[model samples]
Target chain A: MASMERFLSVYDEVQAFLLDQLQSKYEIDPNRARYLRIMMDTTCLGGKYFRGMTVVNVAEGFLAVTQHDEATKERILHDACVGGWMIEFLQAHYLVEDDIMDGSVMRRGKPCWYRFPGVTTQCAINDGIILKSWTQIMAWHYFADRPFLKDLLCLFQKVDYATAVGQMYDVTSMCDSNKLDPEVAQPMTTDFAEFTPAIYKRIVKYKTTFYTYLLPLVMGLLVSEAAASVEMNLVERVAHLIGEYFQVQDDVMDCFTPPEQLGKVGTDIEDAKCSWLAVTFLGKANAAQVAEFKANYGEKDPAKVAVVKRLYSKANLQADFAAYEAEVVREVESLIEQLKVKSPTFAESVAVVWEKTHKR
Target chain B: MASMERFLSVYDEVQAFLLDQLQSKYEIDPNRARYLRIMMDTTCLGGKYFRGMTVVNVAEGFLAVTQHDEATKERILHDACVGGWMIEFLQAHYLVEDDIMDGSVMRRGKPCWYRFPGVTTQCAINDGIILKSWTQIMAWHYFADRPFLKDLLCLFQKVDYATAVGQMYDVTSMCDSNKLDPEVAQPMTTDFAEFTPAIYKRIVKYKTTFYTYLLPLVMGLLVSEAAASVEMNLVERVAHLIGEYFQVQDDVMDCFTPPEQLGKVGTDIEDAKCSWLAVTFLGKANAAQVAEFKANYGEKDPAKVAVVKRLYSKANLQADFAAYEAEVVREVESLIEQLKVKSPTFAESVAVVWEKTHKR
Candidate 1:
């Protein structure tokens, strides 16, 4: 099997490669240049790149035994990398518009694209939709002649659908709060374990796993001539678990990690992100704590930020997230071991999953 | 040919019908019912069903003959109507996010979806995206096995792509003020005269004609097994002219028409929308007016709005828009005369287009 180290290196290469492609092709009339450039910058940068890399890494794994030739390997890697980049592109598209909707001024270490100079706020929203269409076009261009073209197209559409549906779930979940009986806030917190976690997991599966883990790997499997079978199903289940843990860690990091370490100032709390830490904190907090945190934390006050952090610590939310993360890791590790024993070389891609799952 | 009156009625029927379908299918969890209801209400109620009508109407013109029964005709209308509504739905998706970006409070007389108490701002942005995806799925479901399924799908995709592209053009146009260089803007405006109006026709055609004028009519044409030939193209071309006129009149109304008369508020100066009045005003304005207008207009103050309106009157922006509108009407009238001479029945859709255009 090809080395995991080499597979991971493709992330930066692919990111730079995709960015170059975008910048080169990024032309509209001088009138519309700033709008296009800002959108391009936002949608192309500031993503995890996990999804695109999964495609490249997994596709490489599939091609390893059959083709030692450099060109063939590069072609496969290019396809996979493009596919992976589509995932990040789609996420950025949604995030750009979301930032506008949330009234966010900044994102991913820079001002949100809508907040950029020269962009009309309304145009930023339109640009997000354009970003999505561009991703689809990229898929069509890359996968047009491949054997699994139909499958890949279908997978792309499916991911589009699932991501949309997941967003619907997220929106609806938040929307329901208005209908909460004034008295209904009581006992709902206890049931947070049911609704909140279920939502968190669904978000993980639909928004995170399907595109980032399952789709890319499946694309690789289909392209490399692997049959959809018990082995594929088992691997998918494990990846899904790991994906959930990956998101949980992200949520935990948003709250507990220092801003400098994470490479950005996090404001998941101020924006009312439906993160695990927030859900858990809300669930475990006493009424007084809930009221106090709600007032102070989401406001733009340094003291309020400290209060929210203290509330999270008091509720032991970080520890709970950590415990949940460990459980998911163990489950995935067991499955990875089984897959390695059962299908030695084919299971090589699973190592990438393990590394990402366990990333700090 | 199917009666133009009968064909056009399908527009409203389709709107209510799709609204019913969406309402039934989009089951809100008890918790999120309010959120879902508000989104549904705002989007479903706000849009004009003109796009849907156009699809059915144009398709009817295409399906001019050959053993058509009511069931087949209904199905054709239904498909076109559905496709048209999908376009409208996509517009709604854009608007929901656009409102947030614009920081507008009301849409079509109701509060913006994101403004609903239950909806956190970020989640509403995702709501818009999900709506776009819903349109795609609804397309697949509506046109499952039609012979034109592939073409229709491609056309839909093309329109989606075109709209996105146009939006990029529009957004980018706003970003760099100097990019809207007067020289290029004037020529494109003048090209509306000599160019077969194919590309200029696409200005509205790409936006309005595809979903509105063509989709329904083409759907009707396909289902009724009619001949789509040069004659039919003539009729649709006239329809396109009418749609263009309607849009121009709308831009004119934005400057001169009253809020109650138009059923909406007018804010052409503040919004920076690429309305004909703005472009033409800028084109015709003398140096003094331009300086005075630039200093005071496009601001939030009511006094600025009055000053802008006064400048528009002084520049005769509304008159210039009217002059262009008359030119388009004359051209369309000439086309109608030719159609009447060559094929009187084909000219009926043109008549309907005129009535709607003039009424607006």
Candidate 2:
């Protein structure tokens, strides 16, 4: 909440700065500028903004060492929020494209950007690029004079690349483009062979972890100039463990989280996603349960979907998720413990993150 | 020709460097790494590499002033080619998404990347991003130690942003997403009001100029570290003028170029694209000519398309294009003349660019 409070103060400046770059520097035409603004509003402005706040929180982690004057502190907070918003811009941009790629209808309980009145799929695709473009532009603007600007810029470029590769892994594993290419038998309905743990981890690490967990954490440290003095190995190790756990938690929530609580219906099963639920279920299921999971998952029927859920329940896949989270927390705690000797401030910060993230 | 010779020598190194980055450092899995490699082969390798060569040639322009030993000369040549290949990666990447956005069947005498049997639209979209990602990644690997690394990185990032904005302008101007959305009528099927001179130029400058013409010129200059001392305002101005003219020729060729010569069909009119042919026809048409032109353009029927072509001939639009190119040349030469007062070598290089580009 405190991160959001400070983040929002700078969010307005970042949005206008981005829009102005497009409108004035890029010289967008009068009739067409609204689409740019509207896409920003649809995706960038309204999301939960936790990934962005992660940047602020991690920047604050180094507060003990960031000896500075009041104005210097103000600039640090303001620019850290700028860094945070840049990540938000990237995630917001990623979300717009993610919805299109997944054939999703609603996001954050609202219509997808591509599903808007005038914004078609093509427009949305290009809009995703614009979202990314603004992130880079904003990064260049505020951090041009910062010493780690190269690190900041390259982190985003590589993280985005990592995220896209993760997306490729996800799409390749799911092979769900048949709906987009109806004429061709593009992929087998479901090749469960592709759903192994390595493949699943590859997708999550690239898709979810880099952008979602590692990026903002890394961004905060880079922005604060604390990465050089800190044990980056611990930082990355902690983030990776937590990030994988983060996606595991999502897979669990997809199955068990109520519609009222989640605000959207889950479709990982129907969509044939290489989800954690499926991976964990396959590992634990008996002969009959495995057969049922193979048959019922990816089917459109509610009854088939129900049987898939029945299979997860039969084995208590939810309990497996709990154990998975527990192990992840234990490993993360070990890393955090190591971090305590290296940078207790960061270790303390990460413990708070665990408190907020676990069991919610 | 000489530029391509040198550029080709380094192209192999850059391609393998990129693929290895994906395979080794990114740890792309065995099952899915082929997609990344194939996309590179499909779009990155096969295209006409004049844009890539432009970087090499522009770098060559600074050779007279560079004044270095044989080893140093080799490094400049090598790094310039690296810069050139990065541009190719970006253009190749842009082409993948461009084909999807335009709904085209063929590019450079082959099917679009999105039309491949296994590569669907969603994969192609993500692939486009990976293409851009590698370009940035390669830039960092090669140029990180260079003094102008930020310039080189920000140049690509901003140029990409500029190019995406241009694509948005193009898509918005054409409103050509009707095929993608069969349910919608989509902008009264080409509301000629959107095709005014200002709008057309905006589309060309953004979509074609930045990535196609301006980016390469600037890339070579930045890589050479000559950008800092050169009249960058002149470099941008000349490139802008030529960039606008480059797309105008493309617009003209789309209407007049044969499938055999062009290696594929042109569908600007049938696709309802906001082209120079349409804009010119709209501005100069008499009442009956206007009626006939409007009625026949964008029709799927071959005869209707022929009638639209007939209107172009009736008004000698090809002759007008010749006049347009001549004017661009005259204006560019004026800039070149001013450049002689500043830097004769670049002026000499740009004049060579015109020789290769114009009337071909």
Candidate 3:
């Protein structure tokens, strides 16, 4: 089977298992059962499945190289797919809460789970907790007897902690003491001076890179029985580089991409997000331009948006982005080359993330 | 040391451990660390510490009867205290999210964490998640190699799921389609017709009893190596009865006690909660009383509150509560008499809870 077809088949199996568990394990009434089922379907299923797919791709590829026996490989693949679903579950859990905190209206081209009809922010909060509990339960079901079970559980706990810390920074950076209004959905503002590239990098690394890049990659390695062969610190270093590059590309797209293509109009400016472009523009603009940039940023006025856009063009941020992107590509290439000697498939997995994310 | 003093010492140790872990384990910035620290201090500490105290109380009492050696007893007490703190951690996790969902203004004589200065609903969401993860981390740190580690983990997962389910019912029962205003804090209203005694019982059993009554008792038994001595089903049965009585008393106090004593104004009427008194009064009221009850039960007007209180008096609900309270006490006494045959200290532990919550 083609890899994508195989991945989809596994995805369906995971969904089936989850649905069956909802029936057999829990005593939920019809209404709540339907609510939870829809929550699982909407939030957990329909995404790029990149994180989940990565788990399967890296695990199968690593096992194919190391374990030649068909029976052993098949046995490991079943557990690996379960692990893959777990990554997806964690992603869904994070995104549900993320969208609520971001005050995002849509996710994956549909209304966010919180904004869906008949749902409240309370339901969304509980749903996030339920997803997390389900992840741990699934992990225990699949890997509890393995020698590395403690390690696996600890990895998840650590990543979640890091992600929460990242979320804290991202949320608090937007808080403007002067605009503390409970009635307003978004009361935060970005003081352009404080939103340095260093702060931007910290948020990206903690909030995005650790969970997005390192977690899936490491989970696959752990399941494949190849944890000892590669240095995790080396893998994290490369993933961090790639993860930052990926987020920077995302920030660039938020400003430059059309609303039709991206599926929603970007609100990074109106929301006063500490975007890569904002940080870079702050660094490049003169004092007069900086004053103008501060005035124009974080407002809903299209005229002010135009002013910010004009400043972006005048500062030549697109050229700077091109320069930054090239350097990141070169750095990842060097890391992949170094990794090839220890584990060729591992290097290939890292390269796949870079290839997929480096493009628009 | 007195039990209260011992409980306080353990509580302080748990706080210290959490603070140390915050610094050494995670890469949290100074400001964010302070925010989280305050969140933990405010939410986790200063509740009656009843749940945490129960864990320590039962564990120590059970251990005194089972384990004879001083050194072994000392060693186990330390770990048992950690388990006690775990219960407190879980309670704080539930309350932080609960207060947000309930639109509660105060908890433990102070403003709710989400209502505290500079805190948002987002922080409360993340704090709940963090507390849950910390509970597991602490569990693994103390009990990963023990014989019943999986059972310990499963217990936490089950209680959380049950609590979430209860929370779902509690929140949704108040959600009236006609009254939902997205701009308001609390948008749910209860229909007097649907608020039955059975529904109220389910909410109390799942939400209050399972975590508050069953969990600490079970943890104490599990850690004391006494799991096989008694049937857990029996414990749950008795705990459920006690838990229901405890919650019913809480419902009584919500209306009967002064706001100064409860530390917050009771909104069971205005919030349209399916409280014990409301369910009982609905059963007892005549046709005109029922109509009056429905008209005034869930409105915020002071006159409406007075009308509901008068209806309660007219239906003799207060006398009914006194009668119900006597029956609950007799039932718990009978169960304790049976439980004493297996583990006398366990019986004592159960009696302690009945004695504490049986009073106003």
**Top-scoring candidate (TM-score):** 2
In terms of DockQ, which candidate is strongest? 2
- Candidate 1 lDDT tens digits, A53-172: 676667766675665578777767666666666676777776766566656655656667766654546566777777777676666666667777656665666667666656655533
In model 1 chain A, the worst 10-residue window by lDDT is: A182-191
Candidate 1 residues B1-360, lDDT tens each?
Answer: 354455345545644444454446432344444444446456755455665565566556645643578787677766666666676776777677657666767666656777765454656777777667767666666666767755555556655765655554443322334444212221122111212223234345544544445554454444444434336667567656666777667667777877767655777567545556555666676777767766765567889878988877777565676677778878887887877665454566556657666765
Q: lDDT for each of the candidates?
A: 0.61, 0.77, 0.77
- Per-residue lDDT tens digits for candidate 2, residues B1-360, read 366777787777777777777789777654455556666777878766778788888888898777888777677778888888888888887888778777789887888888887777877888888888888888888887888787778788878888887887777666633232323345644346666678788788888777777778888787777765458788788878888887887887887888878767998878777899888888888888878877777778999999988888888776777788788889998988877776778788888777777756
Q: Model 1 chain B, poorest ten-residue lDDT window?
A: B186-195
**Cα deviation of B150 in candidate 1 (Å)?**
3.6
Which runs of model 3 end up more than 4 angstroms from their true locations? A1-26, A68-72, A144-147, A174-193, B68-71, B144-148, B174-193
Worst 10 residues of 3 chain A by lDDT: A177-186
Candidates in order, interface RMSD in Å: 7.3, 6.3, 6.9
Model 3: clashing residue pairs? B174-B189
- Compared with the true structure, model 1 gives a TM-score of 0.78
Candidate 2: residue pairs that collide: none
DockQ leaderboard ranking? 2, 3, 1
